[PDB]
Amino acid sequence: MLTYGAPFNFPRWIDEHAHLLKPPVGNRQVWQDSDFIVTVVGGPNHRTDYHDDPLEEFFYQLRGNAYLNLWVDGRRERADLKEGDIFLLPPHVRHSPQRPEAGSACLVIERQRPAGMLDGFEWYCDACGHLVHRVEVQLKSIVTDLPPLFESFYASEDKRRCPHCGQVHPGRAA
Amino acid sequence: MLTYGAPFNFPRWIDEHAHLLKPPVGNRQVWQDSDFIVTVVGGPNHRTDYHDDPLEEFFYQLRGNAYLNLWVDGRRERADLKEGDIFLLPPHVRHSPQRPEAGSACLVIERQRPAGMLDGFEWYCDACGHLVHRVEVQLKSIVTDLPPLFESFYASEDKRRCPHCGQVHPGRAA
Numbered sequence: 058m059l060t061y062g063a064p065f066n067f068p069r070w071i072d073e074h075a076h077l078l079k080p081p082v083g084n085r086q087v088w089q090d091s092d093f094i095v096t097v098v099g100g101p102n103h104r105t106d107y108h109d110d111p112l113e114e115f116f117y118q119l120r121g122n123a124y125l126n127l128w129v130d131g132r133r134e135r136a137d138l139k140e141g142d143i144f145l146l147p148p149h150v151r152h153s154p155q156r157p158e159a160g161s162a163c164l165v166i167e168r169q170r171p172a173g174m175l176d177g178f179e180w181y182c183d184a185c186g187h188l189v190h191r192v193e194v195q196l197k198s199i200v201t202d203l204p205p206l207f208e209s210f211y212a213s214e215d216k217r218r219c220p221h222c223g224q225v226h227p228g229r230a231a
Numbered sequence: 232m233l234t235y236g237a238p239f240n241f242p243r244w245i246d247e248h249a250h251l252l253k254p255p256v257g258n259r260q261v262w263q264d265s266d267f268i269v270t271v272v273g274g275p276n277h278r279t280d281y282h283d284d285p286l287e288e289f290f291y292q293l294r295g296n297a298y299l300n301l302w303v304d305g306r307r308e309r310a311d312l313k314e315g316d317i318f319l320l321p322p323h324v325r326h327s328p329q330r331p332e333a334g335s336a337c338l339v340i341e342r343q344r345p346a347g348m349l350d351g352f353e354w355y356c357d358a359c360g361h362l363v364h365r366v367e368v369q370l371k372s373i374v375t376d377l378p379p380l381f382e383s384f385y386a387s388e389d390k391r392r393c394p395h396c397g398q399v400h401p402g403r404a405a
């Protein structure tokens with residue numbers, strides 16, 4: 058059958074679940090236990106981390122504006138998600154989704170990482186730009202399974218310690 | 232780098248390439264040689280066939296209206312893509328995308344079928360509802376590689392011949 062129910066108006070939906078869009082990831086997955094992972098992220102989000110997805114990621118800023126800090130060749134950068142734009146992120150490209158304006162909604166779509174495929178979550182230093190701390194995982198919930206790490210890094214000086222210059226990363230408040 | 236270039240306004244795009252949306256599939260792939268397959272299909276389309284995708288398929292009727300004939304348990308049916316709706320098609324569920332109103336645009340997203348994974352394209356009889364003709368393939372272009380079969384079925388009575396009641400399928404004109 059139509060496991061994922063039948064079709065439904067997307068805007069309305071966004072309008073109804075406008076209140077479930079909350080930090081630190083601001084997510085909200087549309088259909089559960091699928092392969093295509095259709096989440097809808099709103100603002101304001103608090104990300105100071107860099108996701109290292111091993112798969113592609115697609116976005117279409119349905120309503121609102123936002124950006125993406127990223128590493129081009131090894132140089133800090135920034136992609137701008139101006140309302141109405143779409144964009145496909147190649148694999149492993151490091152992304153730091155910045156969603157500031159409340160009432161924002163972006164369609165983020167990814168896949169289910171196979172068993173054996175891990176996503177990474179890095180943190181870089183402000184002064185020296187060296188990798189400060191990275192973690193690899195067998196992702197199983199881009200909604201209810203991310204914050205738990207953030208929470209154990211923003212809480213550990215040992216980790217937020219730059220292995221190149223020693224400057225400690227701000228953490229849970231950049 | 233950003234292989235798929237950087238972000239861009241999606242509506243504008245749709246507006247520019249409004250003239251490349253043509254039958255019998257009406258497609259138009261957004262980014263080439265990727266994994267996520269972002270096509271944008273417009274109307275009017277001429278489909279009398281049933282796609283048997285081995286993977287999920289997602290749609291968001293950006294602008295316009297359209298529907299999907301499908302087989303529920305083995306009963307002809309119909310999903311309605313009213314503008315603004317989204318919907319995820321489970322795997323193998325047989326679909327017959329009907330896109331009638333010119334100037335229509337739907338965001339259809341699928342994946343790249345691995346090597347060894349084939350999509351099917353069936354045809355059923357009007358009177359007896361039995362499978363009339365089916366073909367399996369290692370898909371490699373939901374834009375420039377489909378019509379070629381349609382063309383060899385609509386042109387072959389032998390195939391359009393119901394193996395249960397004998398009534399010939401209309402073909403290239405239902």
Ligand SMILES: Nc1c(O)cccc1C(=O)O
Nearest residue numbers: 084098108152154165199
């Ligand atoms: N990049 C993201 C991710 O990996 C999971 C959930 C949300 C995002 C995002 O870009 O907002």
Ligand SMILES: Nc1c(O)cccc1C(=O)O
Nearest residue numbers: 258272282326328339373
């Ligand atoms: N179902 C489709 C497919 O398999 C390829 C291209 C377009 C469609 C569609 O639904 O329009």
Ligand SMILES: [Fe+3]
Nearest residue numbers: 108110114152
């Ligand atoms: Fe990500």
Ligand SMILES: [Fe+3]
Nearest residue numbers: 182185219222
């Ligand atoms: Fe440093």
Ligand SMILES: [Fe+3]
Nearest residue numbers: 282284288326
């Ligand atoms: Fe299909």
Ligand SMILES: [Fe+3]
Nearest residue numbers: 356359393396
């Ligand atoms: Fe028949």
